[PDB]
Amino acid sequence: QMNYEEVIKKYKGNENFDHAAYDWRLHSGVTPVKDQKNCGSCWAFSSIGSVESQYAIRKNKLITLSEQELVDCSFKNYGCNGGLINNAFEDMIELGGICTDDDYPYVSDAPNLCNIDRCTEKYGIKNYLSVPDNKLKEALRFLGPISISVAVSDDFAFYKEGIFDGECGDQLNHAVMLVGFGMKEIVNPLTKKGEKHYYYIIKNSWGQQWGERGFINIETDESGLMRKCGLGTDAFIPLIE
Amino acid sequence: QMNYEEVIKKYKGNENFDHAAYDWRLHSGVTPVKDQKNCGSCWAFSSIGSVESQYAIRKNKLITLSEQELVDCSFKNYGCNGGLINNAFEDMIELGGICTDDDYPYVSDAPNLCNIDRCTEKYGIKNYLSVPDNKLKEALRFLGPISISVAVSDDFAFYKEGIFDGECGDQLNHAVMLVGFGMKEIVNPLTKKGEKHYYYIIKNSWGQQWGERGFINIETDESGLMRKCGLGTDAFIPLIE
Amino acid sequence: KEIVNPLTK
Amino acid sequence: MIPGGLSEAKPATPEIQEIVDKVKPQLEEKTNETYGKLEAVQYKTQVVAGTNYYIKVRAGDNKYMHLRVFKSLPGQNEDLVLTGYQVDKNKDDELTGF
Amino acid sequence: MIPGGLSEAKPATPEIQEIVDKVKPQLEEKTNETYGKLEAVQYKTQVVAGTNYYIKVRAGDNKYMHLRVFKSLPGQNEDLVLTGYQVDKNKDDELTGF
Amino acid sequence: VNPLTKKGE
Numbered sequence A, B: 001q002m003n004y005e006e007v008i009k010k011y012k013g014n015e016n017f018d019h020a021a022y023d024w025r026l027h028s029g030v031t032p033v034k035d036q037k038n039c040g041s042c043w044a045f046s047s048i049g050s051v052e053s054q055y056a057i058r059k060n061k062l063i064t065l066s067e068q069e070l071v072d073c074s075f076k077n078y079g080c081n082g083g084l085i086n087n088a089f090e091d092m093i094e095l096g097g098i099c100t101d102d103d104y105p106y107v108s109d110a111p112n113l114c115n116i117d118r119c120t121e122k123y124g125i126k127n128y129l130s131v132p133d134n135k136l137k138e139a140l141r142f143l144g145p146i147s148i149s150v151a152v153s154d155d156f157a158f159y160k161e162g163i164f165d166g167e168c169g170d171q172l173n174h175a176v177m178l179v180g181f182g183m184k185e186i187v188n189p190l191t192k193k194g195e196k197h198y199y200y201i202i203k204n205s206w207g208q209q210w211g212e213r214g215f216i217n218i219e220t221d222e223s224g225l226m227r228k229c230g231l232g233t234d235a236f237i238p239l240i241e
Numbered sequence C: 001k002e003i004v005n006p007l008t009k
Numbered sequence D, E: 001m002i003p004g005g006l007s008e009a010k011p012a013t014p015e016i017q018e019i020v021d022k023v024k025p026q027l028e029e030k031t032n033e034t035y036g037k038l039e040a041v042q043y044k045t046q047v048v049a050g051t052n053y054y055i056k057v058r059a060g061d062n063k064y065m066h067l068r069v070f071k072s073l074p075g076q077n078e079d080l081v082l083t084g085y086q087v088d089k090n091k092d093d094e095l096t097g098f
Numbered sequence F: 001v002n003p004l005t006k007k008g009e
């Protein structure tokens, strides 16, 4: 059906259809939520979550892929106490993809081992991963997820159940999925840079009952390039198609 | 004492085998890397890591064994200025067991002491076997990670996420382990040639801060003896089973 | 290897 | 800094010292050291489902000590309990993991 | 004939006469004298979780030493430290420490 | 400024 920019007389464009926003857990998106549990391994979640979410998006396949197969061995990351996102999926274009759910759980890392050439089934990736802040102005013009970074002012996990505005943490501490952007109202202006009703929905790896029931809305501009919290620094898009 | 005269016989004796890439670390068997830190003790890590490994590769019950019930309980080895995995193995086959890592803690270069009756843990070996220089791409595959020794250059100590294409030491004065091997499809820096370079996955007793998680990778090929630093001269392994 | 006829469940 | 990890150590302010006293209640029913009250002068903090603090406390003859706990997430009172025990481990273990 | 340890002695490179110069920066532990840096003689080396370059030196009324110095691993900043030092020895009696 | 800069007449 015919949804958006269509020349009808004389002028045209370049797939620049709205310059507006709607959220992408509602229009084909999102996978379930998960608890991190005396382990800080959020790289794992965001990273392997993007593989699984791009599955449910690109193909209507719906894989609820595991997290203790890059946190039982990614011998290029430094444990449940370390790991990056700069290269947290580049260890699944060499592993065959990570082994999956309903035949393997996450188990909190009481000092443990790998079980990787044990399974008959695997689901992995083909393409690479890097979203520039020059693709986070249209952020989800892919119709699919992103793996940006968030710093926490520790006035973050404060179960605001809502929105947070402010100058965030100090270093890109935690890893956060991008479940989309929302657009509530547009600027209600002040002397300079007035009230932001516009919002940014982002999933998290902390818990399932936290804020917007596992998610956190924050405060973007018309575009997405004038926030704080340093989001747009480490964005990556793991694809298989 | 004993050797590969009647021991390999059952595994890759009566049977021949094959592979190009087999790591006992992506295979539910190896245990954590740890440190030595200014005390002349590199041998303790190799031995205690070795016994941890085989228990978990056989009856898959993990142990973290202790390197302070060794270094100061040496009866025939030297101590915090040097030591010999050949005989640290055997000092263990006269005691009765090695304390778990956290049933007898570790300090650094600081003058501490030794007790063996602060344990009831009987984590021991019935005997051990001696592993030749030549068979070391098939010694870490059926018989377990062999507690090798290496050389030290001042190039060696500097790591990154790559294979060693640098020079080496002026003598073989160190002690590490060998876990496995593999093959990696690559390009030519000048061509578009099908260059496939082989490696050796070894552990380390330097920090788990090291790029590939206390697993540093050096030059060896399908021959088994392209060693660029002499990886396999001292390489014997203990026999819990 | 373990591919179709070998595996248990 | 590291997603899931941290950066260098920060100057010991009294709030990690109150986390200290909660750790010491836990510490004495299964530690040979019939324990008590201590003195905290180092720490590091992490981004977990919680805040995974480490407490460098001083104790013993001349060795020092280290521990782990987490201010839980603001579910209910943040009622921190353990997640690590490495007793009388020096001031020079680079603020360890237990 | 040992895997992992010390190695029998060696004459000299002046880039372990860079670590001898750092002796005065890493003293005022128990030094007790006025010697405003010690002058070196011979060389020795160890290979552990760092390059623990060993070196000896001189003093006031000509009594030498056998130290247990320590450089850094490829880690954090420029630190050179003192592990164990001693004095009141002869030039023929050489470097030790266990 | 060039995401759909339809400047001119």
Ligand code: NA
Pocket (backbone or CB within 6 Å): none
């Ligand atoms: Na299915």
Ligand code: NA
Pocket (backbone or CB within 6 Å): none
């Ligand atoms: Na790359």
Ligand code: NA
Pocket (backbone or CB within 6 Å): none
């Ligand atoms: Na395969």
Ligand code: NA
Pocket (backbone or CB within 6 Å): A153, A154, A155
């Ligand atoms: Na605060």
Ligand code: NA
Pocket (backbone or CB within 6 Å): A020
């Ligand atoms: Na609107």
Ligand code: NA
Pocket (backbone or CB within 6 Å): none
């Ligand atoms: Na301004």
Ligand code: NA
Pocket (backbone or CB within 6 Å): A233
């Ligand atoms: Na940037």
Ligand code: NA
Pocket (backbone or CB within 6 Å): none
């Ligand atoms: Na013989």
Ligand code: NA
Pocket (backbone or CB within 6 Å): none
């Ligand atoms: Na026999």
Ligand code: NA
Pocket (backbone or CB within 6 Å): B094
């Ligand atoms: Na005996």
Ligand code: NA
Pocket (backbone or CB within 6 Å): B153, B154, B155, B168
């Ligand atoms: Na060199």
Ligand code: NA
Pocket (backbone or CB within 6 Å): B153, B154, B155
């Ligand atoms: Na060098």
Ligand code: NA
Pocket (backbone or CB within 6 Å): none
């Ligand atoms: Na670097």
Ligand code: NA
Pocket (backbone or CB within 6 Å): none
């Ligand atoms: Na060459």
Ligand code: NA
Pocket (backbone or CB within 6 Å): none
């Ligand atoms: Na050529």
Ligand code: NA
Pocket (backbone or CB within 6 Å): none
């Ligand atoms: Na050339």
